[PDB]
Design a protein around this ligand. Structure first.
Ligand SMILES: *NC(=O)c1ccc[n+]([C@@H]2O[C@H](COP(=O)([O-])OP(=O)(O)OC[C@H]3O[C@@H](n4cnc5c(N)ncnc54)[C@H](O)[C@@H]3O)[C@@H](O)[C@H]2O)c1
Ligand SMILES: *c1cc[n+]([C@@H]2O[C@H](COP(=O)([O-])OP(=O)(O)OC[C@H]3O[C@@H](n4cnc5c(N)ncnc54)[C@H](O)[C@@H]3O)[C@@H](O)[C@H]2O)cc1C(N)=O
Ligand SMILES: [Mg+2]
Ligand SMILES: [Mg+2]
Lengths: 359, 360
């Protein structure tokens, strides 16, 4: 049983972390009887240096033909000064649209081993287990009209439009509901409907679907409160559904509960289409090549790649299990270092994670 | 002296916290030879229930002609179902634009007594200090075009426009830099310039003014890292400048560092015009009339009114000191209750601040 996997290493620590996950992927899948066809294609800063655009057509077709796509990270200091159309991050947004992967899943759950690693008091952060369902292919990140023009004044004005059509909200809502059922049956839609006509529609469509999902209990919370709640009593959430710009911010805030931004993986899914799996981190421009980075998040994106994109649930559990063994043995990278643990770097963790897969 | 203060008690817990602050404002100013003309006006749900709109024209004029504006909060379940034009929250937005208070100062600094009140560990949260300078009157909260239309396929499509003109960015960056130089000399601009052309201009303009303030050490951070940073190592920030919507989010997150959202005051300032002072929290529909509320944010929001809006610094320090006295005496409301303290509600906590103002 063979699968075609496209690796998009990217920039920063992207290559570093993906190489590790690729090996974890081959070994874990091999134990459950699957081999893989790996194929590196350029994206972001890498593609810019090679072909001159952040996302070449050659990459998009290569990703579509594949069964699933594993991305590292994107962006870097060298290209921070390009035109808006030639920054690397523009490649990531395009690949999300190109793959039509609207439903973005970021699960932040605190492992018992990393409780001392969080910055939250133990009682606050122990046992947290929430899942963020973020709208990925629409909204202010993809909203038209946008740009910077110069009106008659001679003043520059920058503008983007946060815009969602109803069907865009509906599809992400069901995924929230379906997911919130698979968990603890509680769902929380986060918007800013006290001000934004976009958030008015957002809540309006989400309240609609609750009748179709009575197994799921829906509640609504404003985005400013939710950021505070994720620090006051983060244990409260089961599933949170929200839009692109709030999904990005809140999920990035939630990481520091589990111990670091380097612990969180993300699965980006579509109907039919092959899924896009990446870590929410990216892309450590300041510890690039120093071999300091935490690769766990990228490994788990390979876990999620198997679980959600290819359905090899058994293999994915082996991946989770290895990360658990590795942490039980005391191995921490810099960001998840606790007193009395063992501070490894990146290769030197991936190896002895792979020790656990292989045992 | 004799200043005119407009009290906008809003909704929810608004009335009680402002009432308590009104007494503290009165006494603290009174000790320094200062009197006040208090004029109460309807805003938000109160005004909807009275005249049928969130912000009556009579309220705006009364607010304009006063020296300082003291607001509680806005919003409540009763009015959550009105047409968009008729939402209490829109009155808040309207009074800010009407008063042209673009510079929003929300300072989150962790007090020694409330370290245990935080959910961040002591080492992380002890000595935290930061000030958020938020663009208040521009941005997505005020951007046109906006509305809910229907495209030809009959689908309802909602939209807002995040838009900043160059001068909108410039003046608030100036406030940020000016704030830093009185502070610890660090400024951190937060945007999403990897995706948003609005923020690209925000970055372009803010870096530009950096040449005018060599005294201030300016750094740039994307908003998603910013959220993780306020939890990873919040001791780092000195002054943070950002736009309307990112300011809302980040300032609420930063609140929990100091113990609860009920600790944070906010001053909103304008050129020449009288400023609008509110606590950053909402109307707390869940604790309203139970006398559970934390008044400190509003008592401290009254402190900012004296210091920043009226220049009565000595009286303003009287309010600040009293909050400290009450906290040294063990008094906590529910949101800032840490073990072995004395749990009180809103009305006595307020009396215990007053108890202490009148002791010096
Ligand atoms: N969706 C993406 O792939 C993505 C999201 C956001 C930004 N980028 C691009 O990366 C660089 C830099 O962005 P930052 O503002 O620096 O945010 P991060 O790069 O993730 O840095 C956060 C801090 O945490 C550290 N960190 C990240 N990942 C880590 C791991 N695995 N181990 C240890 N430490 C990690 C970082 O060093 C930071 O200190 C920009 O160009 C942006 O466009 C891509
Ligand atoms: C800015 C934004 C929104 N509002 C309006 O206020 C209404 C309340 O909704 P919300 O629950 O989402 O925000 P809120 O701050 O009210 O709630 C915060 C949570 O924390 C508790 N809490 C708040 N404030 C206090 C205080 N002062 N003391 C103790 N506990 C507090 C609350 O129980 C709650 O759980 C909503 O309609 C929204 O429209 C208002 C503002 C503004 N400045 O007016
Ligand atoms: Mg991010
Ligand atoms: Mg707020």
């Amino acid at each position: 049983k063979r699968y075609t996997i496209t690796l998009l290493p990217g920039d920063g620590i992207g290559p570093e972390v993906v190489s590790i996950a690729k090996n974890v992927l081959q070994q874990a899948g091999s134990l459950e009887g699957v081999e893989f066809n790996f194929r590196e294609m350029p994206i972001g800063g890498a593609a810019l240096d090679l072909v001159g655009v952040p996302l070449p057509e050659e990459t998009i077709s290569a990703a579509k033909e594949s069964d699933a796509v594993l991305l590292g990270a994107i962006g870097g200091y060298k290209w921070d000064n390009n035109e808006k159309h030639l920054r690397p991050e523009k490649g990531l947004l395009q690949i999300r649209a190109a793959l039509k992967v609207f439903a973005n899943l970021r699960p932040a759950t605190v492992l018992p081993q990393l409780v001392d690693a969080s910055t939250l008091k133990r009682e606050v952060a122990e046992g947290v287990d929430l899942m963020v369902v973020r709208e990925l292919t629409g909204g202010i990140y993809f909203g038209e009209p946008r740009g910077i023009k110069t009106n008659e004044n001679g003043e520059e004005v920058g503008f983007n439009t946060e815009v969602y059509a109803a069907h865009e909200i509906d599809r992400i809502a069901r995924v929230a509901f379906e997911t919130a059922r698979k968990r603890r049956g509680k769902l929380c839609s986060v918007d800013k409907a006290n001000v934004l006509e976009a958030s008015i529609l957002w809540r309006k469509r989400v309240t609609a679907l609750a009748s179709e999902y009575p197994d799921v209990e829906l509640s609504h919370m404003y985005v400013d409160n939710a950021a505070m709640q994720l620090v006051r009593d983060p244990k409260q959430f089961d599933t949170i559904v929200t839009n692109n710009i709030f999904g990005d911010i809140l999920s990035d805030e939630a990481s520091m509960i589990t111990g670091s931004i380097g612990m969180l993986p993300s699965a980006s899914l579509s109907d039919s289409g092959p899924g896009l799996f990446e870590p929410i981190h990216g892309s450590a421009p300041d510890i690039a090549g120093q071999d300091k980075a935490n690769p766990l998040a990228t490994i788990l994106s390979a876990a999620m790649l198997l679980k959600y994109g290819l359905g090899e649930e058994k293999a994915a559990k082996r991946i989770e299990d290895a990360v658990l063994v590795a942490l039980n043995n005391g191995f921490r990278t810099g960001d998840i270092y606790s007193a009395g643990t063992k501070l490894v770097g990146c290769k030197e963790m991936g190896e002895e994670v792979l020790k656990s897969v292989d045992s």
